Amino acid sequence: QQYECVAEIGEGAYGKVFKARDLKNGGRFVALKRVRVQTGGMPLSTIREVAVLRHLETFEHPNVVRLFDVCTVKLTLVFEHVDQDLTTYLDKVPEPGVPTETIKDMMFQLLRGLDFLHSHRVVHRDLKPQNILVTSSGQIKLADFGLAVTLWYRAPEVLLQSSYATPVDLWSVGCIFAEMFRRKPLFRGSSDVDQLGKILDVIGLPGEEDWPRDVALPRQAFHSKSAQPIEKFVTDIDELGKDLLLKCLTFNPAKRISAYSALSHPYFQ
Template sequence: MAQESAVQYEPVAEIGGGAYGMVYKARDRNTGQFVALKSVRVQTNQDGLPLSTVREVALLKRLEQFDHPNIVRLMDVCATLRTDQETKVTLVFEHVDQDLRTYLEKVPAPGLPIHQIRDLMQQLLCGLAFLHSNRVLHRDLKPENILVTSRGQVKLADFGLARIYSCHMALTPVVVTLWYRSPEVLLQTTYATPLDIWSTGCIFAEMFRRKPLFCGDSEVDQLSKIFAVIGLPAEDEWPTDVTLSWQNFSPQAPQPITDCLPEISEKGAELLLEMLTFDPLKRISALNALEHPFFTE
């Protein structure tokens, strides 16, 4: 990790503040190209950076060598010592002008044609399958960190950052959206790669609706909104090690998914329900989703 300051990059605009602090659009003084800068302050030990941060950044840089078309490029990592206890780590990513949220807002009525949804989903799942095959969880998939280039190329951003920022997150009271969170994350039980598939299902539905599928304002409310669509799972499917018990929710039968998504095709509805499966072990994987008949119908 380069111990120089990020003077090579000249900030030109604030892109916005995520859960992880401000993001800046900047110009690389050496090449003239635009980049996105994300900085985080990490607590340091005697040897400089905490090992966990070094490890996470090394992992992100290792993924870089594959140069995957659906993954945003990490161009550089700069570390600047601020005080003895604190180091500022700046991650320099390629800059893409729009995210999926903006992209969907620009779509004229009646919405995206199915071939376009199919293309976006295929690219999203390719990026995700790549991350999962490298044992990287995204953990925070939502339309804001799925970038879409002017040529329609999908690139996943902000993956792996949750781990780097988790220690820092405790210090920042940020409202993080629950809308794309899987039931196992909402219930605070163990989670693995299926948590990203749940988020992908929510995003898939949003491509048809052009508005989010489940808009809860608390963990319980979010779960209630989910069960109103997929039904309350059987009691024996409920995880055992959680504070929220199954009895907290009223029994509900699953609704036909076409009630909230009249435009979805039959195969699309099948795939969506395989992604929005309560039990993470029964949820479809990214690789299997790519093989789904929805993509060839």
């Protein structure tokens, strides 16, 4: 065999990720993701999703994890190995937290890799610090995308089950943006209705025209009254970071800022 697994990195709905030894490339560390596929025979939606992943590899974007090899048997993906994710970085950073300019750089690399995905019509749909990898040199690399439970980073339209477009990932970016300063999740709910309730306690109840129609939860189901200043939960944030954070934490996904427009925000000057 060409690879040799040495440890398990994690398992879940994505599959099972292993830390492996690239026996034919000098023994470098790699990440093997095995995923079973119900053959009949392989589903066309899975074959098409792999072609998009190899096409996205041709660009070799620095803010997405590298795809080295693809093997078949039921489906093994060989990615470059990153030593830690975002949670491990936030847990190990000394006091009083992440440097202010380090947050700006990591948020910029996050938006670059996300804009690269949205430019090719790819929605991450599950952006969270657990799948945001931090290179030993400090680079941000996105992982676990393109292949089809914490609700703390779900967009309001996902909790309401209405729309699932690219603004879904920008809401998660806002939740991660606040967690940069807080080093603890901003909206930490225990259910679908609980997560949406703690969201509306901060950003306030949106207008009746902003609430999606033909959803189970109506606007009257929540009495969250008014909004609160964001600097109460996210201390040490500046004016430019506050304006960018609020444009990501917009209820209406149509009024939410895009990853492309977020790259040109005055916060990155």
